[PDB]
Scaffold this motif. Structure first.
Motif, PDB file in Angstrom:
ATOM      1  N   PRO A  54       0.905  -1.109  -0.237  1.00 57.52           N
ATOM      2  CA  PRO A  54      -0.111  -0.023  -0.004  1.00 57.52           C
ATOM      3  C   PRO A  54       0.716   1.062  -0.012  1.00 57.52           C
ATOM      4  O   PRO A  54       1.430   1.688   1.115  1.00 57.52           O
ATOM      5  CB  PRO A  54      -0.961  -0.140   1.383  1.00 57.52           C
ATOM      6  CG  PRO A  54      -0.196  -1.292   1.909  1.00 57.52           C
ATOM      7  CD  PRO A  54       0.512  -2.188   0.975  1.00 57.52           C
ATOM      8  N   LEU A  55       0.851   1.908  -1.193  1.00 52.60           N
ATOM      9  CA  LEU A  55       1.731   3.128  -1.253  1.00 52.60           C
ATOM     10  C   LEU A  55       1.153   4.252  -1.134  1.00 52.60           C
ATOM     11  O   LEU A  55       1.643   5.400  -1.524  1.00 52.60           O
ATOM     12  CB  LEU A  55       2.344   3.018  -2.772  1.00 52.60           C
ATOM     13  CG  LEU A  55       3.017   1.676  -2.999  1.00 52.60           C
ATOM     14  CD1 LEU A  55       3.608   1.539  -4.563  1.00 52.60           C
ATOM     15  CD2 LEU A  55       4.247   1.545  -2.245  1.00 52.60           C
ATOM     16  N   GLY A  56      -0.221   4.473  -0.708  1.00 57.28           N
ATOM     17  CA  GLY A  56      -1.018   5.626  -0.455  1.00 57.28           C
ATOM     18  C   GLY A  56      -1.660   5.951  -1.899  1.00 57.28           C
ATOM     19  O   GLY A  56      -1.702   5.233  -2.931  1.00 57.28           O
TER      20      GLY A  56
ATOM     21  N   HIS B 249      -4.899  27.273  -0.886  1.00 56.50           N
ATOM     22  CA  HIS B 249      -4.785  26.605   0.498  1.00 56.50           C
ATOM     23  C   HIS B 249      -5.407  25.281   0.390  1.00 56.50           C
ATOM     24  O   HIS B 249      -6.555  25.191  -0.408  1.00 56.50           O
ATOM     25  CB  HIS B 249      -5.216  27.518   1.535  1.00 56.50           C
ATOM     26  CG  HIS B 249      -4.543  27.210   2.961  1.00 56.50           C
ATOM     27  ND1 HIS B 249      -3.378  27.139   3.087  1.00 56.50           N
ATOM     28  CD2 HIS B 249      -5.228  26.589   3.907  1.00 56.50           C
ATOM     29  CE1 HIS B 249      -2.962  26.610   4.280  1.00 56.50           C
ATOM     30  NE2 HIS B 249      -4.133  26.508   5.051  1.00 56.50           N
ATOM     31  N   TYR B 250      -4.968  24.338   0.805  1.00 56.08           N
ATOM     32  CA  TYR B 250      -5.490  22.840   1.003  1.00 56.08           C
ATOM     33  C   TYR B 250      -5.558  22.518   2.231  1.00 56.08           C
ATOM     34  O   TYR B 250      -4.205  22.143   2.691  1.00 56.08           O
ATOM     35  CB  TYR B 250      -4.953  21.998  -0.190  1.00 56.08           C
ATOM     36  CG  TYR B 250      -5.741  20.586  -0.402  1.00 56.08           C
ATOM     37  CD1 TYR B 250      -5.584  19.656   0.565  1.00 56.08           C
ATOM     38  CD2 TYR B 250      -6.658  20.590  -1.481  1.00 56.08           C
ATOM     39  CE1 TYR B 250      -6.262  18.525  -0.006  1.00 56.08           C
ATOM     40  CE2 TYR B 250      -7.319  19.463  -1.529  1.00 56.08           C
ATOM     41  CZ  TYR B 250      -7.259  18.378  -0.880  1.00 56.08           C
ATOM     42  OH  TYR B 250      -7.879  17.243  -0.957  1.00 56.08           O
ATOM     43  N   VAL B 251      -6.459  22.131   3.014  1.00 54.92           N
ATOM     44  CA  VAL B 251      -6.547  21.557   4.347  1.00 54.92           C
ATOM     45  C   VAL B 251      -7.359  19.932   4.009  1.00 54.92           C
ATOM     46  O   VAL B 251      -8.563  20.262   3.581  1.00 54.92           O
ATOM     47  CB  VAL B 251      -6.705  22.333   5.466  1.00 54.92           C
ATOM     48  CG1 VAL B 251      -6.569  21.295   6.845  1.00 54.92           C
ATOM     49  CG2 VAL B 251      -5.833  23.362   5.507  1.00 54.92           C
ATOM     50  N   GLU B 252      -6.744  19.095   4.477  1.00 55.67           N
ATOM     51  CA  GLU B 252      -7.586  17.712   4.352  1.00 55.67           C
ATOM     52  C   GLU B 252      -8.751  17.545   5.173  1.00 55.67           C
ATOM     53  O   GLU B 252      -9.826  17.042   4.841  1.00 55.67           O
ATOM     54  CB  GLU B 252      -6.511  16.673   4.365  1.00 55.67           C
ATOM     55  CG  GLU B 252      -7.214  15.020   4.065  1.00 55.67           C
ATOM     56  CD  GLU B 252      -7.605  14.810   2.702  1.00 55.67           C
ATOM     57  OE1 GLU B 252      -7.362  13.720   2.252  1.00 55.67           O
ATOM     58  OE2 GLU B 252      -8.025  15.559   1.719  1.00 55.67           O
ATOM     59  N   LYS B 253      -8.570  17.964   6.580  1.00 55.09           N
ATOM     60  CA  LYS B 253      -9.373  17.780   7.447  1.00 55.09           C
ATOM     61  C   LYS B 253      -9.457  18.895   8.559  1.00 55.09           C
ATOM     62  O   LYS B 253      -8.882  18.679   9.567  1.00 55.09           O
ATOM     63  CB  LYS B 253      -9.522  16.415   7.966  1.00 55.09           C
ATOM     64  CG  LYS B 253     -10.770  15.669   7.416  1.00 55.09           C
ATOM     65  CD  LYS B 253     -10.540  13.954   8.106  1.00 55.09           C
ATOM     66  CE  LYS B 253     -11.369  13.162   7.192  1.00 55.09           C
ATOM     67  NZ  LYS B 253     -11.308  11.852   7.750  1.00 55.09           N
TER      68      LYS B 253
ATOM     69  N   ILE C 155     -11.798  13.687  -7.979  1.00 54.46           N
ATOM     70  CA  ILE C 155     -11.473  13.629  -9.574  1.00 54.46           C
ATOM     71  C   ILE C 155     -10.570  14.541  -9.808  1.00 54.46           C
ATOM     72  O   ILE C 155     -10.460  15.796  -9.368  1.00 54.46           O
ATOM     73  CB  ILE C 155     -12.884  13.775 -10.125  1.00 54.46           C
ATOM     74  CG1 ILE C 155     -14.189  12.996  -9.739  1.00 54.46           C
ATOM     75  CG2 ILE C 155     -12.737  13.641 -11.748  1.00 54.46           C
ATOM     76  CD1 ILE C 155     -13.619  11.518  -9.974  1.00 54.46           C
ATOM     77  N   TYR C 156      -9.635  14.026 -10.520  1.00 53.09           N
ATOM     78  CA  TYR C 156      -8.313  14.914 -10.882  1.00 53.09           C
ATOM     79  C   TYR C 156      -8.116  14.880 -12.219  1.00 53.09           C
ATOM     80  O   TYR C 156      -8.349  13.724 -12.838  1.00 53.09           O
ATOM     81  CB  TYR C 156      -7.115  14.644 -10.077  1.00 53.09           C
ATOM     82  CG  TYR C 156      -7.485  14.368  -8.688  1.00 53.09           C
ATOM     83  CD1 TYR C 156      -7.070  13.096  -8.027  1.00 53.09           C
ATOM     84  CD2 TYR C 156      -7.822  15.573  -7.633  1.00 53.09           C
ATOM     85  CE1 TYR C 156      -7.208  12.885  -6.613  1.00 53.09           C
ATOM     86  CE2 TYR C 156      -7.993  15.033  -6.269  1.00 53.09           C
ATOM     87  CZ  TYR C 156      -7.559  13.913  -5.820  1.00 53.09           C
ATOM     88  OH  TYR C 156      -7.904  13.625  -4.661  1.00 53.09           O
ATOM     89  N   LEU C 157      -7.455  15.924 -12.977  1.00 54.59           N
ATOM     90  CA  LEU C 157      -7.004  15.707 -14.264  1.00 54.59           C
ATOM     91  C   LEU C 157      -5.495  16.159 -13.958  1.00 54.59           C
ATOM     92  O   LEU C 157      -5.103  17.143 -13.683  1.00 54.59           O
ATOM     93  CB  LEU C 157      -7.842  16.731 -15.218  1.00 54.59           C
ATOM     94  CG  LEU C 157      -7.380  16.522 -16.675  1.00 54.59           C
ATOM     95  CD1 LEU C 157      -7.204  15.169 -17.052  1.00 54.59           C
ATOM     96  CD2 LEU C 157      -8.594  17.095 -17.225  1.00 54.59           C
TER      97      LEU C 157
END
Ligand SMILES: Nc1nc2c(ncn2[C@@H]2O[C@H](COP(=O)(O)OP(=O)(O)OP(=O)(O)O)[C@@H](O)[C@H]2O)c(=O)[nH]1
Ligand SMILES: Nc1nc2c(ncn2[C@@H]2O[C@H](COP(=O)(O)OP(=O)(O)OP(=O)(O)O)[C@@H](O)[C@H]2O)c(=O)[nH]1
Ligand SMILES: Nc1nc2c(ncn2[C@@H]2O[C@H](COP(=O)(O)OP(=O)(O)OP(=O)(O)O)[C@@H](O)[C@H]2O)c(=O)[nH]1
Ligand SMILES: Nc1nc2c(ncn2[C@@H]2O[C@H](COP(=O)(O)OP(=O)(O)OP(=O)(O)O)[C@@H](O)[C@H]2O)c(=O)[nH]1
Lengths: 406, 406, 406, 406
Positions: B88-90, B166-170, B183-185
């Protein structure tokens, strides 16, 4: 010539044993270090004149069951055979279906032992009482509390002849304080009533308690033998801890080499502790009362272990406190983690012992009981698992209290 | 030339899907009749110029996964390959480890889709926004409630250039009402930052959100595309019911032949209902809103089915009411039995939608949620199963309310 | 810092090992008592500065492989990791695909060992020759017969600089008497040509001999180191007997405690004999030259054992003669039975050693070779099995000569 | 009320079926498109008054057997139950051990059919002959060649009363030209001799031919019914091809919709051809006499198929000639490859039909017989496989003639 029939269950009967019964069958679960029917096979091989031990159940023969059969045949110098039923036939239907394999060689009597009981197994006293009286059915019974007897099969007997006059499997009212221990001694004549029961189902599945014991009670065919030894019923997964406690107490007279002693290069030991020889325990650990350790178990430094069962392959890292828990196969507990359960024993003498239903719950709330970790469960460092059931192959990341982690 | 990488999980990620994930992998669970990554493969095969669909995960290739791969390759006329990681590599480590198989043939861009999302999948709008701007990372984001955004990955963006600052996951505090849709491109240039992350771990496992998205935010490499379509996260076993409700609503425009109509020789139908052609439904049954039926399902007379998923092989006998439930594979519900759950939709727009933790519990009490029956679960006649989780191969005998039946 | 990459195969490569490879993988087959890659792990752990041992193959991780990994990590005090490829990538494609895991920590060099070779493993001499010269590829080569060299990879070298000028993997004509031993020493620079090979396949599967060794020969990148030690290739099931013979000869200098001695309460012993400590051999038995006994093997009285491998759990009853045979796991040979094979050692120095094709046949006729019994094969009493292959779980009833018993 | 007992074997009995019996049990092997005991269940369900069909064998219940049981119960509107023995009890020991399940409901008679026979199954003629005469044992017998009768169980009878006076299972001399067909009709009284046989073993395993039929012959209890219909014994893997030819000939009267016809958009068809509806056959292919095609089989253009069985999932590429072969499950044959066998039908009327031993060999040489490919066998392009047996999951690279490729 004598025989012994151990009624192991099948996969449906082990569902109540669920987080431990996901990897190995419930009969092969190790209580006090050896599997739970190896106590029965031990006690049956000690009886003189015992020719064969038959196991009747509807498990499919896989590698743990056949490996246990070969190991038991080598260890106890006795043929241990597994008779697999074609369907779940109940407790008496497997005895009636395999009547030709049971009566082969014309035995004098055959014991019938339920595989889920923990007993001191007084087969010689029971056999000699049978050799004096020679009745078709002989039951082992023990005295229980008046509140607890409604959980077990009550036996109303006549005290002069020790003949049961009434049998109710789960009465709503108190009828008797003597309960059925799941140990029976059968004459060959005792396969004659079971046949009649089978014919009444045709005009397959025979329950030995409801169809044979309750119906023939008072007619002079069923008799009781009363003991004062240890007795317990292993139904849920946490009941095996109490059976382990009882068997480790029994080991003081039966196998004194199995209990672990104070060693100057070894861990501190309180009470009765079983340690497997393959297990490596650090000397800074202390292992408290009623602790069983399996093979290949690494126990770190400063580990407190009290009233626990650590199954084989499990790793407890440093300064880990484990109380009232069952640590599964290959399951790893990180450092400074606390795996704690609340003591819950299924003994028929305690008045506020629990009522032992299929439900682990009450009013939505999970009941406080033994913490069970399944196989290959990873507990992270400095995390508390309190009163929780963790299903196998689960990797946790935080503390869980009073839950069932799916 | 375009590619698509669907990040399916492994067996550890499916443990939160536990009573349904005991038989089939969580990616192959049927939401609205077809497996949950077949929606992704459907939407990726609709994009013109899509050459290959790669699935990266650490499931071992067994018969359901390979059978799905062959069926998807035949159905969608596209090579659907499974790349199995060694560990499992994430979420980003499998993208970096398989960089030579992803960039083979030199694609213009490749989509990266998390397999547990239910979306309307606007890949063409996202692709065309990328073809105008040509940035390394393009994210799909949707608007959420202010209370619900703390469950998902919040994106603080600049509204003129649609660039995330800015990005915060939780986050514990509100930082943004725009959340990441999974969903990413990706441009080929986007495999260049991931390498740098990998080198910083050596001075293996790369989390795409924590190591790449939060660290490169505001530097002009990550950009957002905002949609208003349907979106849900399938994490627990009951979330698949809400995803089924969304996909059956989507079927009114996408697959109108999959929804079932009123037939004079057929059952009554309210709302959106999927019925498999192999399933035999009695005409006295009524199948209410948001109901999915699988193959070989026998539905008796008088059966009420509302907001449910009935998996393949299951049998509902006569006058059985099933509401807010998932009925497992081969599991039989007896006559006049009631299998009821409480609706718990995991949508980011409802303010008192639930907070969606690993724990199914609160204060000891099990939370009222979707009733889940595992595979081969036998429910007896005239027995209520209310708000309960039943583990597979269980034969019940009485009514259970608000429990987890092991 | 040094590393070691043992290229184990997959299930397709073990098909030529077929009656023994039906139960355990071909890398885990015990030659001279220990599994065949434990010799490689033994020799790599003896090299100073060896940090990690990686195994690259496309076997799925089951219980024997993971149990071997845990046992090897405990025994040799080294991380032994298994890198599973997503597809069979050839001998060089797994080295190129796992280039980030191989070059992690920046090793000075890494050995590359084919798992099917039996060698004396001169890794220290090879390493020191590399530390003097520092070339990208270093090969281990040995001298062969002129007729036998057409079976192996011939190396035409220049004797002054020990640089190979030509490499042909299976030439129809004699080009060289030096053959490739399947032991390589790689510099980090050696992963740079493999990349070029991979790019030439895109304008996945890299064969290290055909694409890298034959193409770069004479350009100064590949160099040879010549040894005179033992060498063999384990391809078919009977080649493991010759490898066992060579390893038991090596045990006289390497593990002198593993060979069995004459004991007054023990069996007669000629030549080099390995007996496991768990195995119980009767004192009337004599165990001739080059005999390996596994754990739990009961050997009866009067048993002749010569040039044989008896796998674990097997039972030889009284007065049983076993010559040039491999007796599988749990397979029982009855009393006065004769299990005989014809010797056929695969060494490159014997001129009439066999030509070692996939076919076990010639002109319809099965070739006389090693008798192989699969697992759980029951041989009845007083029955001869001569030059035969018996597939697993077979119960025979009569004598079989020169056959393949399906 | 009538019953039917189909004596399927176990895993030891299927070893002679070995390359096909590696994936599915020998009873579930499809001859002429449907599994081989579905012909027995078809013929038993056609008899009026047939209440139940019991299958007695010692296979463990896995997914193919239980799936077949559910499909047969749905298709033939009859309870089809599987009674699993605890041990291999022979041909009569399973009939005696399950005597309570056979005689349940008090049937008038029960058929006993060996599962490995291919017959036209004249159960109604046999039943009516029994209803006239009412003897305990009724045998089905057919006429054979004088040389072939030594392979089968010969019946010496009296022609007036049709009562067998002598039974020898495999005589070295000619005693009779009437052989036992493996179809029996048993009265309930016929379970009374079997009991006596069982008691003579105690002063378990009962062979019905050697212990009951040969011993009670001439005493008025065993009687013969003679037919002229088709009969064959499926013992080895290539005998199923001859049974397929016989059943496809029987389909002209029994299931005329199962045979394939000439279609203008379809392939050319000679003789009796079964094609599954799921199979896709190219129109340029021609499918010669006695060809069976399974589900999901892709047959390319120009494919010649004659006297063959193509199991499900197999792919034949373009211009592939397959004669006298069995192509396994998922096994792929490349373009211009030729898979050829030599005809070998084991019928008792041909004088130079083969003698049908366990050995596939003679004088070292493999006998020319049916070419059998196991499951997932890859045949490369332009490669001939002639008279060869290829074991499953094998990838070939060259032509093989008259071999067993392990
Ligand atoms: N062979 C066989 N054994 C069974 C079957 N059902 C239960 N058993 C075993 O019989 C024993 C008792 O079964 P239960 O029905 O749970 O009865 P109990 O609740 O323990 O009650 P008591 O015997 O009165 O103490 C257990 O060891 C079961 O494993 C069965 O269908 N077949
Ligand atoms: N290949 C691979 N996929 C993974 C791995 N871990 C998770 N995934 C997949 O990646 C997706 C998201 O993984 P999570 O870590 O649960 O992230 P999330 O909670 O859904 O959060 P968001 O992506 O922000 O919506 C799911 O489809 C997982 O199945 C992994 O180790 N390897
Ligand atoms: N990881 C991996 N290893 C492989 C693969 N194919 C073969 N091997 C291993 O590589 C070694 C040699 O493979 P072969 O192709 O049979 O080559 P060889 O015939 O032994 O020839 P030489 O190496 O020159 O002695 C064996 O140990 C195989 O197990 C593969 O696809 N992947
Ligand atoms: N239930 C059960 N069936 C068996 C057993 N052994 C064989 N059978 C079945 O009984 C049938 C005949 O068995 P065989 O011993 O091979 O006898 P045969 O060689 O076919 O000879 P004939 O019956 O005279 O034609 C086959 O269908 C076998 O599958 C057994 O031990 N138990």
């Amino acid at each position: 010539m004598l025989k012994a029939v151990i009624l192991i269950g099948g996969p449906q009967k082990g569902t109540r044993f669920r987080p431990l019964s996901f990897e190995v069958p419930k009969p092969l679960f190790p209580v006090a270090g050896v599997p739970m029917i190896q106590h029965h096979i031990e006690a049956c091989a000690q009886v003189p004149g015992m020719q064969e031990i038959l196991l009747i159940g509807f498990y499919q023969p896989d590698e743990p069951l056949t490996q246990f059969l070969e190991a038991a045949q080598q260890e106890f110098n006795l043929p241990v055979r597994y008779l697999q039923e074609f369907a779940p036939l109940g407790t008496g239907g497997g005895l009636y279906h395999f009547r030709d394999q049971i009566l082969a060689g014309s035995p004098e009597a055959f014991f019938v032992l339920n595989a889920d009981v923990c007993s001191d197994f007084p087969l010689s006293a029971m056999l000699e009482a049978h050799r004096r009286q020679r009745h078709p059915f002989l039951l082992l019974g023990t005295t229980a509390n008046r509140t607890q007897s409604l959980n077990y099969g009550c036996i109303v007997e006549n005290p002069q002849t020790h003949e049961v006059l009434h049998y109710v499997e789960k009465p709503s009212t108190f009828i008797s304080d003597i309960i059925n221990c799941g140990i029976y001694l059968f004459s060959p004549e005792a396969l004659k009533p079971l046949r009649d029961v089978f014919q009444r189902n045709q005009q397959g599945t025979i329950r030995l308690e409801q169809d044979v014991f309750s119906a023939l009670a008072g007619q002079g065919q069923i008799y009781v033998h009363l003991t004062d030894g240890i007795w317990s019923q292993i139904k849920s997964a946490g009941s095996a801890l109490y059976a382990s406690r009882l068997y480790l107490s029994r080991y003081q007279d039966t196998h004194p080499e199995r209990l672990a002693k104070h060693t100057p290069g070894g861990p501190w030991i309180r009470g009765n502790v079983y340690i497997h020889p393959t297990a490596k325990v650090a000397p800074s650990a202390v292992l408290g009362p009623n602790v069983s350790i399996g093979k290949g178990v690494t126990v770190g430094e400063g580990v407190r272990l009290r009233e626990s069962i650590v199954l084989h392959g499990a790793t407890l890292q440093e300064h880990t406190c484990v109380l009232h828990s069952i640590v599964g196969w290959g399951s790893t507990v990180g450092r400074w983690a606390r795996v704690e359960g609340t003591p819950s024993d299924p003994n028929p003498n305690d008045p506020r012992a629990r009522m032992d239903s299929e439900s682990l719950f009450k009013d939505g709330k999970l009941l406080p009981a033994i913490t069970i970790l399944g196989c290959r469960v990873r507990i992270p460092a400095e995390v508390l698992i309190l009163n929780s059931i963790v299903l196998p192959h689960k990797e946790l990341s935080r503390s869980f209290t009073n839950q069932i982690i799916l």
